[PDB]
């Protein structure tokens, strides 16, 4: 629930779009296993997709480590310092591809409730409303019931 979970505001890592888009994902470590049905999909991904993904995203370093593993994993490190570890255990090639693409397209900011669907650093162009807007001014600035 929102009250039982942290929250943040919509934001970008370094104003990611103003000048140029910078892919926030920087590292992808795939822990895979030679043997083990859990990492069959991971093995197929390494064989058939990882090269294409690497060349499509030249700004992401991919570390494929084949060691004995019961739960193959993918650790995504983002420019902002966030680390997201996802299990690719018993996931088909398509599922692994979608997960990896989502990690690539996703920023390092925490996946928590976002308070507002929008964020403006300049919400007002004409002047934020204050009680004295839309209020006429009186001669010599005389408050009501003032004698002189």
């Amino acid at each position: 629930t929102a009250r039982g979970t942290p929250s943040r505001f919509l934001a970008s890592v370094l104003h990611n779009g103003l000048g140029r888009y910078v892919q926030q994902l920087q590292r992808l470590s795939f822990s895979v296993s030679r043997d083990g049905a859990s990492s069959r999909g991971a093995r197929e991904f390494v064989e058939r997709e990882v090269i294409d993904f690497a060349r499509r995203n030249p700004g992401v370093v991919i570390y494929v480590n084949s060691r004995p593993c019961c739960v193959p994993r993918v650790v995504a490190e983002y420019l902002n310092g966030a680390v997201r570890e996802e299990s690719i255990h018993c996931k088909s090639v398509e599922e692994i591809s979608t997960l990896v693409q989502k990690l690539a397209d996703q920023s390092g900011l925490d996946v928590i409730r976002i308070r507002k669907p929008f964020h403006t650093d300049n919400p007002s162009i004409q002047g934020q409303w204050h009680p004295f807007t839309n209020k006429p001014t009186t001669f010599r600035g005389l408050r009501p019931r003032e004698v002189q």
């Binding site: 370094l14 000048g19 910078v22 470590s29 700004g59 992401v60 300049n122 007002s124 204050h130 009680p131």
Partner: protein
């Protein structure tokens, strides 16, 4: 005892997590941790920033003098990034000055200098480097990298970009990664000033305008503990600006700040930067 291993393994992992949370480990540079390759990381840095860095220049920019001294000491028991950092700092200062002067021709030289100092300061540059991964590729003799070393490395990277791609590409890089840091910031949030009324009086004297006259445009709850005072500065019986405040003096000071912003062309509703 309940026969089984998987529940015990899960509990052991959770106990490890709790232990780590209770006693966090000291920070360690990303180089030490597994899954690291300096050449791949630096090439990815260049490609990610979308710039054809020359690898030798980028490596020289990332290597710092303190790292050289520490490595020599360890050897007892490499070209630093000084020149690249100097070139990058000089170019960044000049290019930011050009951008700011073109965008705000009315801003005074002191204001432009203060804005450039803010953009090239330790805080902003350190933040940009940290979120651009300059720190990870930075070779230093202590971790976390101190802000001074991080700033020097970032400007060395800018200098390497200048030597590789050229002034135009470097200017685009600066516009994208340092000018953007002034978005949402306020003129006097970036350029700290004292006696804005004095500054405004001086500017109006230079512009040949009669000295401003403070005038209580609006007020609310004067005798209460939460007053509002809208004080306007009138020159020749013409409103140049008006500012709110809690006390009359604070309102006058804020009105002076508003007038300075309007004169220098750094109003909140000013034309957004063109990227």
């Amino acid at each position: 005892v309940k026969k089984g291993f998987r529940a015990a393994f899960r509990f052991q992992k959770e106990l490890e997590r709790q232990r780590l949370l209770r006693c966090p480990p000291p920070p360690v540079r990303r180089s030490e941790k597994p899954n690291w390759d300096y050449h791949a990381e630096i090439q990815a840095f260049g490609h990610r920033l979308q710039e054809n860095f020359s690898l030798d220049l980028l490596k020289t920019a990332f290597v710092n003098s303190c790292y050289i001294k520490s490595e020599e000491a360890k050897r007892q028991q490499l070209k630093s990034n000084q020149e690249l950092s100097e070139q990058g700092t000089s170019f960044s200062q000049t290019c930011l000055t050009q951008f700011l002067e073109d965008e705000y021709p009315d801003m005074p030289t002191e204001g432009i200098k203060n804005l450039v100092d803010f953009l090239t300061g330790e805080e902003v540059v350190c933040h940009v480097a940290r979120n651009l991964a300059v720190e990870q590729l930075t070779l230093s003799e202590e971790f976390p990298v101190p802000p001074a070393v991080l700033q020097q490395t970032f400007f060395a990277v800018i200098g390497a970009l200048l030597q590789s791609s050229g002034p135009e590409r470097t200017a685009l890089f600066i516009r994208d990664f340092l000018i953007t840091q002034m978005t949402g910031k306020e003129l006097f949030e970036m350029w700290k000033i004292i006696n804005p009324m004095g500054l405004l009086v001086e500017e109006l004297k230079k512009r040949n305008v009669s000295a401003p006259e403070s005038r209580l445009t609006r007020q609310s709850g004067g005798t209460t503990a939460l007053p509002l005072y809208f004080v306007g500065l009138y020159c020749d019986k013409k409103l140049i600006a008006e500012g709110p405040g809690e006390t009359v003096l604070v309102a006058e000071e804020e009105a002076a700040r508003v007038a300075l912003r309007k004169l220098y062309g750094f109003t909140e509703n000013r034309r957004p930067w063109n990227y």
